[PDB]
Amino acid sequence: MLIKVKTLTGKEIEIDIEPTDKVERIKERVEEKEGIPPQQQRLIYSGKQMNDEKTAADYKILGGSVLHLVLALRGG
Amino acid sequence: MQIFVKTLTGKTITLEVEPSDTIENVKAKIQDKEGIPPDQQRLIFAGKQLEDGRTLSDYNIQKESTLHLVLRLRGG
Amino acid sequence: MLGFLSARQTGLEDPLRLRRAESTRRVLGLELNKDRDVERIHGGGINTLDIEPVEGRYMLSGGSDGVIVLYDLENSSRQSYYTCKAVCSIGRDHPDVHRYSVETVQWYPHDTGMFTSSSFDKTLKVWDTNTLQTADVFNFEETVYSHHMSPVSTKHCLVAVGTRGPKVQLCDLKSGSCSHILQGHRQEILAVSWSPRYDYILATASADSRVKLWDVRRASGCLITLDQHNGKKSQAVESANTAHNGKVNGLCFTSDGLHLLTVGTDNRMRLWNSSNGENTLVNYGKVCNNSKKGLKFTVSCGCSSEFVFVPYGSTIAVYTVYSGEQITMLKGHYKTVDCCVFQSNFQELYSGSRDCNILAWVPSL
Amino acid sequence: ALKRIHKELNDLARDPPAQCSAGPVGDDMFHWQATIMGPNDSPYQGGVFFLTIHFPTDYPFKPPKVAFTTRIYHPNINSNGSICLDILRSQWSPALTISKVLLSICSLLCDPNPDDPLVPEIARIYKTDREKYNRIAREWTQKYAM
């Protein structure tokens, strides 16, 4: 499926993932196409901060399901 | 150039504006586009009131941007 | 506490001694927990809670907006801190949701598969825990403040339902017949409760300051009519034998079933004997309540001295049942407390309030 | 009505607002959870404040009870996380949809009105000294939002 990870500025980064990828995979894919390493993301899908161990199928992420990306500058 | 605004009724309309243009004329354009009075609009960009006595160039607005239209509110 | 461990080890004291002493110590050190949370799901207040009797795992809650959440109190995570995630919920989108406030949700005794609820929509629905579908619904002619199922009866499955009419209703979850009624009260029936010990002894509290124990097998009135002064101010039973001075809106048999705690709007508790209705003169001091519906409260189990947890204004009060001393006053809420339920397994207390919160109190250390 | 909420959910999934995100928490569609990213050029920058929406049984013609879950520093929002917008209590309008109430709240995060405040203790600080306000709000954001 395609998830388009749109950030604050409105830029709509496209991403592709299999239905069972762990959200760390999603953050890593965002790293490749956008450049922010996975430590500094906080992906928010439909008002639930996604947790780094859940599988994407947990949240019922479908084709064209827009996430939100917010920078955590500290990010450990 | 032009700009996108998302009216209240779900529709979206495109406004032909210039950066020098003031927000009062922007609200007047919203009016004669669909007709909610200059007082009742409250344009939102990046979660900021678009002040009536200012221009788009003040708020760092460029082409293919988006402005959000809501109903006038107040504090409490 | 090492003394208790050694005493248990060398067989001096029975293991019962350490078990009960430690449970009492934990309940005495009860405090609110920020190391635990219960997810906020009710739009309005929480009117009722009932941890499941067997295994103490799930937990219902009757929101004042008609939503029946079904929590899960087991820390399925790995961290010390966790939140009791809501497994299921009878949301407003549900076809058979309660239209108005749900004020009693109780698990079907001896069977966690089902559970029951009742609301001001004048309905009592028998919910199936698995598919969340109404197995049976009984429609009353008037509201339903509180209902209760016998936690001991393996023979019958009647359900006392205290409507705001003067007549206690008995609904049968087996072949439906709400015909059986118990006449004798004079005003609304704000809180009923079956006897945990005897199968057929039902204690019903009303708003006319009378607490009556009914032998539902008997069809000629009530066994007893509780009287404050134990018959000192003797008067025939036409306008006398009032267990309180104002509305009496809460009943809770002690765990053993030997004593019937009653709390009423006159701001007093009274530990009545459950076999002859003789007030035992336990003081309890002045307990504050002003609610105008069923006030829920529970009594500890498996502790040396039986504690009672009564909603006291916006705070939970912890009294010792058989001495009346005030142990403490748990203080963490923002509005009046409507229901506190004791988790007997681990000595934990969950207290839903009117501020949409369900604060889980747990012992310290 | 559900169908109104269904249409809102679909048209929000398709074309989401920029710095907002709301979706049902579980099976019950009447109980959403939302999220207001702190607007840029504000003490709330980089923050993620979680709301908790509750739609009534007549949602088009009756406001939803939104209430902050992340303790926000604001004259118009009490420590309990409750808001006091006029649009949300008195001047509710069906045409206003959840994507709009959330955005209006986001805008009001930067445009409080200490006159008639829900928290006069903070309102006095805001009215008198705005320099300290932008630091106390910043520390609250850093200690709750991040």
UniProtKB/Swiss-Prot annotation, chain A:
One of its GO terms (biological process) is ubiquitin-dependent protein catabolic process. Gene3D superfamilies: Phosphatidylinositol 3-kinase Catalytic Subunit, Chain A, domain 1. The modification N6-acetyllysine is found at K48. SMART domains: UBQ. Changing A72R: Prevents adenylation by UBE1C. Highly expressed in heart, skeletal muscle, spleen, thymus, prostate, testis, ovary, colon and leukocytes. Keywords: Acetylation, Isopeptide bond, Nucleus, Ubl conjugation pathway. The modification (Microbial infection) Deamidated glutamine is found at Q40. GO terms for cellular component: cytoplasm; cytosol; extracellular exosome; glutamatergic synapse; nucleoplasm; nucleus; postsynapse. It is found in: Nucleus. It holds the Pfam family ubiquitin. InterPro entries: Nedd8-like (IPR038738), Ubiquitin-like_dom (IPR000626), Ubiquitin-like_domsf (IPR029071), Ubiquitin_CS (IPR019954), Ubiquitin_dom (IPR019956), Ubiquitin_ubiquitin-like (IPR050158). GO terms for molecular function: protein tag activity; ubiquitin protein ligase binding. Interacts with AHR; interaction is direct. Interacts with NUB1; interaction is direct. Interacts with ESR1. Belongs to the ubiquitin family. This is Ubiquitin-like protein NEDD8.
From Swiss-Prot, chain B:
Changing K63R: Abolishes HLTF-mediated polyubiquitination of PCNA. Changing R54D: Decreases affinity for UBE2R2 in CRL2(FEM1C)-UBE2R2 complex. Changing G76A: Loss of ADP-ribosylation. Impairs ubiquitination by CRL2(KLHDC3) E3 ligase complex. No effect on ubiquitination by CRL2(KLHDC10) E3 ligase complex. The modification (Microbial infection) ADP-ribosylthreonine is found at T66. The modification ADP-ribosylglycine is found at G76. The modification Phosphoserine is found at S65. It is a peripheral membrane protein. Changing T7D: Impairs ubiquitination by CRL2(KLHDC3) E3 ligase complex. There is a cross-link at K6, K11, K27, K29, K33, K48, K63 (Glycyl lysine isopeptide (Lys-Gly) (interchain with G-Cter in ubiquitin)). Changing G76D: Impairs ubiquitination by CRL2(KLHDC3) and CRL2(KLHDC10) E3 ligase complex. There is a cross-link at G76 (Glycyl lysine isopeptide (Gly-Lys) (interchain with K-? in acceptor proteins)). Residues 1-76 form the Ubiquitin-like domain. Phosphorylated at Ser-65 by PINK1 during mitophagy. Phosphorylated ubiquitin specifically binds and activates parkin (PRKN), triggering mitophagy. Phosphorylation does not affect E1-mediated E2 charging of ubiquitin but affects discharging of E2 enzymes to form polyubiquitin chains. It also affects deubiquitination by deubiquitinase enzymes such as USP30. It comes from the Eukaryota. It is found in: Cytoplasm; Nucleus; Mitochondrion outer membrane. Exists either covalently attached to another protein, or free (unanchored). When covalently bound, it is conjugated to target proteins via an isopeptide bond either as a monomer (monoubiquitin), a polymer linked via different Lys residues of the ubiquitin (polyubiquitin chains) or a linear polymer linked via the initiator Met of the ubiquitin (linear polyubiquitin chains).
UniProtKB/Swiss-Prot annotation, chain C:
Pathway: Protein modification; protein ubiquitination. It comes from the Eukaryota. WD repeats lie at residues 33-73, 88-129, 133-173, 177-216, 235-274, 281-321, 325-363. This is DNA excision repair protein ERCC-8. Part of the CSA complex (also named DCX(ERCC8) complex), a DCX E3 ubiquitin-protein ligase complex containing ERCC8, RBX1, DDB1 and CUL4A; the CSA complex interacts with RNA polymerase II; upon UV irradiation it interacts with the COP9 signalosome and preferentially with the hyperphosphorylated form of RNA polymerase II. Interacts with ERCC6/CSB (via CIM motif); promoting recruitment to lesion-stalled RNA polymerase II (Pol II). Interacts with KIAA1530/UVSSA. Interacts with a subunit of RNA polymerase II TFIIH. InterPro entries: G-protein_beta_WD-40_rep, Rad28/ERCC8/Ckn1/ATCSA-1, WD40/YVTN_repeat-like_dom_sf, WD40_repeat_CS, WD40_repeat_dom_sf, WD40_rpt. Keywords: Chromosome, Cockayne syndrome, Deafness, Disease variant, DNA damage, DNA repair, Dwarfism, Nucleus, Phosphoprotein, Repeat, Ubl conjugation pathway, WD repeat. GO terms for molecular function: ubiquitin-like ligase-substrate adaptor activity. One of its GO terms (biological process) is transcription-coupled nucleotide-excision repair. It comes from Homo sapiens (Human). It is found in: Nucleus; Chromosome; Nucleus matrix. Signal peptide: none annotated. The gene is ERCC8. Its main location: nucleus. SUPFAM superfamilies: WD40 repeat-like. One of its GO terms (cellular component) is nuclear matrix.
Swiss-Prot record, chain D:
Changing C84A: Catalytically inactive. Loss of ability to promote FBXW2-mediated GCM1 ubiquitination. Inhibition of TNF-alpha-induced degradation of NFKBIA. Gene3D superfamilies: Ubiquitin Conjugating Enzyme. One of its GO terms (cellular component) is cytosol. One of its GO terms (molecular function) is ubiquitin protein ligase activity. GO terms for biological process: protein autoubiquitination; protein K48-linked ubiquitination; protein modification process; protein polyubiquitination; protein ubiquitination; ubiquitin-dependent protein catabolic process. InterPro entries: UBQ-conjugat_E2_core, UBQ-conjugating_AS, UBQ-conjugating_enzyme/RWD. It catalyses: S-ubiquitinyl-[E1 ubiquitin-activating enzyme]-L-cysteine + [E2 ubiquitin-conjugating enzyme]-L-cysteine = [E1 ubiquitin-activating enzyme]-L-cysteine + S-ubiquitinyl-[E2 ubiquitin-conjugating enzyme]-L-cysteine; S-ubiquitinyl-[E1 ubiquitin-activating enzyme]-L-cysteine + [acceptor protein]-L-lysine = [E1 ubiquitin-activating enzyme]-L-cysteine + N(6)-monoubiquitinyl-[acceptor protein]-L-lysine. The active site is at C84 (glycyl thioester intermediate). The keyword Transferase applies. SUPFAM superfamilies: UBC-like (SSF54495). Pathway: Protein modification; protein ubiquitination. Residues 1-146 form the UBC core domain. PROSITE patterns: UBC_1, UBC_2. Its EC number is 2.3.2.23, 2.3.2.24. It is an enzyme of class 2 (transferase). Pfam families: UQ_con (PF00179). Keywords: ATP-binding, Nucleotide-binding, Transferase, Ubl conjugation pathway. PANTHER family: UBIQUITIN-CONJUGATING ENZYME E2. Belongs to the ubiquitin-conjugating enzyme family. This is Ubiquitin-conjugating enzyme E2 D2. It comes from Homo sapiens (Human). The gene is UBE2D2.
